[PDB]
Amino acid sequence: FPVATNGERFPWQELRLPSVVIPLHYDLFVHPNLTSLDFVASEKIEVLVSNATQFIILHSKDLEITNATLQSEEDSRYMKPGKELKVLSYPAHEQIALLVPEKLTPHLKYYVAMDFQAKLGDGFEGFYKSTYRTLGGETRILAVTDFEPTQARMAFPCFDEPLFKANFSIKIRRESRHIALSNMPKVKTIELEGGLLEDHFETTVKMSTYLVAYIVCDFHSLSGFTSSGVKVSIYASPDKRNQTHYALQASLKLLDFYEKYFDIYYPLSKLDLIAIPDFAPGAMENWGLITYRETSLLFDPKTSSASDKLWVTRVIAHELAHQWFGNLVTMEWWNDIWLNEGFAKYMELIAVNATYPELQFDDYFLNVCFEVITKDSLNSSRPISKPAETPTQIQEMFDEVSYNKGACILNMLKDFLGEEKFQKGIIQYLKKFSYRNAKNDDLWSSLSNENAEVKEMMTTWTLQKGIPLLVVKQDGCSLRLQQERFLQGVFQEDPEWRALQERYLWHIPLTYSTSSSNVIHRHILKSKTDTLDLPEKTSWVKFNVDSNGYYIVHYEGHGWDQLITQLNQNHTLLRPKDRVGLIHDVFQLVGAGRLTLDKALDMTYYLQHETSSPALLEGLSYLESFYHMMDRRNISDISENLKRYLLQYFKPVIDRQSWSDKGSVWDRMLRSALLKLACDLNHAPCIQKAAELFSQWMESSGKLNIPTDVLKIVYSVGAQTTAGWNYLLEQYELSMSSAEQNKILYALSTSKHQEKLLKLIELGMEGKVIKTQNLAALLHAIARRPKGQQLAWDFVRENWTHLLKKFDLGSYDIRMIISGTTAHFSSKDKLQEVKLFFESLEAQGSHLDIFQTVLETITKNIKWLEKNLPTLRTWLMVNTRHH
Ligand SMILES: *[C@@H]1O[C@H](CO)[C@@H](O[C@@H]2O[C@H](CO)[C@@H](O[C@@H]3O[C@H](CO[C@H]4O[C@H](CO)[C@@H](O)[C@H](O)[C@@H]4O)[C@@H](O)[C@H](O[C@H]4O[C@H](CO)[C@@H](O)[C@H](O)[C@@H]4O)[C@@H]3O)[C@H](O)[C@H]2NC(C)=O)[C@H](O)[C@H]1NC(C)=O
Ligand SMILES: *[C@@H]1O[C@H](CO)[C@@H](O[C@@H]2O[C@H](CO)[C@@H](O[C@@H]3O[C@H](CO[C@H]4O[C@H](CO)[C@@H](O)[C@H](O)[C@@H]4O)[C@@H](O)[C@H](O[C@H]4O[C@H](CO)[C@@H](O)[C@H](O)[C@@H]4O)[C@@H]3O)[C@H](O)[C@H]2NC(C)=O)[C@H](O)[C@H]1NC(C)=O
Ligand SMILES: COc1ccc(C(=O)O)cc1S(=O)(=O)Nc1ccc(C(F)(F)F)cc1N1CCCCC1
Ligand SMILES: *[C@@H]1O[C@H](CO)[C@@H](O[C@@H]2O[C@H](CO)[C@@H](O)[C@H](O)[C@H]2NC(C)=O)[C@H](O)[C@H]1NC(C)=O
Ligand SMILES: *[C@@H]1O[C@H](CO)[C@@H](O[C@@H]2O[C@H](CO)[C@@H](O)[C@H](O)[C@H]2NC(C)=O)[C@H](O)[C@H]1NC(C)=O
Ligand SMILES: *[C@@H]1O[C@H](CO)[C@@H](O)[C@H](O)[C@H]1NC(C)=O
Ligand SMILES: *[C@@H]1O[C@H](CO)[C@@H](O)[C@H](O)[C@H]1NC(C)=O
Ligand SMILES: *[C@@H]1O[C@H](CO)[C@@H](O)[C@H](O)[C@H]1NC(C)=O
Ligand SMILES: *[C@@H]1O[C@H](CO)[C@@H](O)[C@H](O)[C@H]1NC(C)=O
Ligand SMILES: N[C@@H](CCCC[NH3+])C(=O)O
Ligand SMILES: N[C@@H](CCCC[NH3+])C(=O)O
Ligand SMILES: [Zn+2]
């Protein structure tokens, strides 16, 4: 039924490749030219034929195939010369067909040889070109690969599905001014007649096609050896070698931990980490050659803050964990992508907390779960395991549900089974499926070895969307436990609520503590309703200890009153993470209609005595978001009352903040948040100090030691004048620090001149001074402010076709460009314009799940204002009289 490009019929119909021909070994030779910006290449694929067939089906996209032969040492019909193969192209499924002269014999091995060529990509996928700037002002070119999920077919024809694992022998031809890096160590370099060089790399272990990598560049490196003898090297552009020191130290510690914790050595001799100047994701876990964004790998003590230090440590730990969860053990199909991303996201918590406990990443992990709850509490969410077929649908699987929710339900399972039993389970899981593939049921069986308990439990957490809501009622010593599906913007008395609660049931591993006993008590909630008996008549009971469970708790009667009373009288009687969860769940239930906003704002009164930075920053984030929500809607009477309440009720902790980098990680993050909040509210002492620091910095004409914790704040104030704004843009182009450029670009986005904001968008589109990889984050930073809100929304609508040429439809950049310019809307006027814009894109044949997610988010903001805006106005006005 499918027709090929030459008019003939295509002998294959399905998007999935046939299983009759299995690849065993790839011989891959690539000859890129960094002057003509193209390449020629050839390959020889050793395949095993299990079923007699007249054709071979392979993936190939945007590749010109010139030769195609089939040889065999076991089938004499295809001896040493071979037989020519006729190729048929079917771009709709990104497949090609290799028609053989005589049907292949089962159980015999063959060799598929092909010559192919194409230009270097101009985007971020496949084998594409990237540029960087030297300290002297030179621009250099490199060639780099990025294949996950389905872009290996853009560089070489292959069975581009993760189940078709095979060995890879890679050879790269290059000039003497370049080096060549790949997955495996370089075995030898041969000099060619014309003066070129050809690097031969060791044959890889069994691995999926999306992990193949090769780079041609002129980077420098710093090297070190782990305890197991693995040579770790950090690669970066030559003028940035000093910024690779921390990456090497962290990689050595983290790789050693992963080897001991997983009880499985890293199987390769070397592991390279390279900072790519043009890179779309944070990083990519190519086996033995992990590619990074410069902000994800490089660290400069002069311009990188402690939160940047935490960020680099997270990404390195994330990609090194992938060497086991991802490279060693891969999912069968992208429907279970969370087996890689969820575990790698989870192992961040275990590895960073064990290797760098001073970073206090354990407290920051709650933000990972709270972030995905925002999208999981909407109906437009999805189960973490969901079928996916098209390349766009596969790209949509890389979201907060696979990453964040996967890590959070794994942390919940760890707390239910215990660290020792959980660690033993994943060790058996990794050893059982080494160099093979696994699905969800494989993981549940490995963690089972009570058995049917964890499989039936985790089934409801992976095949059902959303997050459950635990409702607790307390009378005397009796506890009535009820579970519902937590919905945002949908009240219980709404007609849609009944239709959204049916056939939703979770096996929730409940954990609770009381005021009489701090001992943790556990109970598995399997049904819709259950009862529990308490030993003593306690004053309160706090469920979900430390928020280890992926569920929200609501208390009926005086439940919240008892807990809020406890916070105002003796807040240290509640665990520090219990306070974080309480502050979080209270404001979530206000949006759910189970609590009025004044009850939530009453809890924030105790924050005057809160010294635990996680809880303090959590409560401040809601008050800060409320202010910006009013500011964007020009509700000046509420925003002014919120500004005065913040600057007055939290004046003690604000005034005692220094403009330095002293203290622990959370001390420095508390400083940056408080001083950013104060300066955003135009607090005169904050503005006077920040403008003084920027003045001295600019008057120095160079870089004086400005504390990194206040670096983003100082630059933001300096960008409020055209003189300082022009100087920052000049400093941006000359900066050798990607972290500083990140902070500088944020400062330029805080300008109130629309001509300056449009210039940044134009520069981001041009991609020369401001790289296009920062366009999505730049549009978001401009849109979240009142002066740039309309500009960004207008730009996305008017230049949609131009944006779709820079990124793929399913790319994460397009997702943030759409969401980052629309999600913060909260008026029916904007909801209509967004609804019409999405409908026009649907007419053009572009469908994304982010469309309904944005629409539901905007409706939630509308209904949140309709239900709580007068309460917020009244509570603030009552506060001006309570003083
Ligand atoms: C990516 O693509 C680029 C562009 O195509 C390649 O760069 C060019 O590579 C070619 C081939 O290496 C270079 O051309 C050669 O230059 C040599 C140096 O020339 C000097 O010496 C001669 C006398 O010997 C003088 O006349 C000349 O003015 C210079 O002073 C020449 O010696 C070579 O000539 C010989 O080779 C050619 C082969 O085609 C013969 O036809 C000639 O008759 C002669 O025998 C040759 O001209 C060229 O200079 C490069 N360009 C640049 C800008 O550097 C990359 O090599 C390629 N990279 C990869 C990895 O593919
Ligand atoms: C494609 O990639 C796969 C990997 O996925 C390769 O398979 C490996 O092949 C090598 C060489 O044939 C094997 O290396 C040998 O390993 C032995 C121990 O292996 C055990 O332990 C590991 C630990 O993880 C298990 O994974 C494994 O299944 C075994 O249980 C060593 O004892 C060997 O060293 C000794 O033997 C050789 C040969 O006699 C001597 O020369 C040495 O000096 C030494 O005395 C050897 O190192 C490896 O085990 C295989 N791995 C797997 C997972 O099967 C393919 O070879 C590769 N294909 C191509 C064409 O490159
Ligand atoms: C492979 O990548 C990651 C590895 C590990 C982690 C981990 O959990 O530590 C996360 C990512 S990520 O891809 O999720 N990273 C990200 C997310 C959101 C944003 C946003 F701008 F929307 F806020 C930006 C980024 N990065 C960081 C700097 C800007 C460039 C991309
Ligand atoms: C973060 O790391 C710390 C330090 O190892 C962990 O605390 C240890 O936990 C084990 C098991 O519960 C105890 O046997 C140790 O005595 C603890 N040590 C200390 C210093 O407290 C902590 O559990 C880790 N956090 C997570 C979430 O895994
Ligand atoms: C909430 O989400 C569910 C699941 O996506 C929706 O149920 C499906 O909705 C689509 C389109 O509305 C229908 O084509 C399907 O037949 C529905 N399936 C079922 C089993 O109901 C539901 O409509 C959504 N509700 C709201 C209010 O958006
Ligand atoms: C391959 O051959 C086996 C041999 O029994 C058969 O069961 C299977 O259906 C065949 N599959 C295809 C796709 O021909
Ligand atoms: C890198 O660090 C060394 C260490 O002494 C120093 O000499 C050199 O000037 C530094 N270079 C850059 C570009 O920071
Ligand atoms: C909070 O609890 C501690 C622990 O008993 C106690 O020492 C402290 O006085 C309490 N705070 C107040 C304000 O009572
Ligand atoms: C905000 O409202 C005031 C009062 O109606 C008006 O003068 C001002 O122009 C408005 N500004 C914006 C940005 O909407
Ligand atoms: N697997 C990568 C993401 C690849 C995204 C490719 N567009 C990770 O660790 O998150
Ligand atoms: N620290 C990163 C930003 C991380 C964004 C997290 N959502 C940077 O330098 O840009
Ligand atoms: Zn990942």
Coordinates of C-alpha atoms and ligand atoms in Angstrom, one line a residue, residues 631-636 786-787, ligand 9:
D631 CA 1.4 43.0 38.6
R632 CA 0.8 41.3 35.3
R633 CA -2.9 42.1 35.6
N634 CA -2.3 45.7 36.7
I635 CA -4.2 45.1 40.0
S636 CA -2.1 47.8 41.6
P786 CA 4.4 43.1 32.4
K787 CA 6.4 45.2 30.0
Ligands
LIG9 C1 -2.9 50.2 34.7 O1 -4.1 50.8 35.2 C2 -4.0 52.3 35.3 C3 -5.3 52.8 35.9 O2 -6.4 52.4 35.1 C4 -3.7 52.9 33.9 O3 -3.5 54.3 34.0 C5 -2.4 52.3 33.3 O4 -2.2 52.7 32.0 C6 -2.5 50.7 33.3 N1 -1.2 50.1 32.9 C7 -1.2 49.0 32.2 C8 0.2 48.5 31.8 O5 -2.2 48.3 32.0

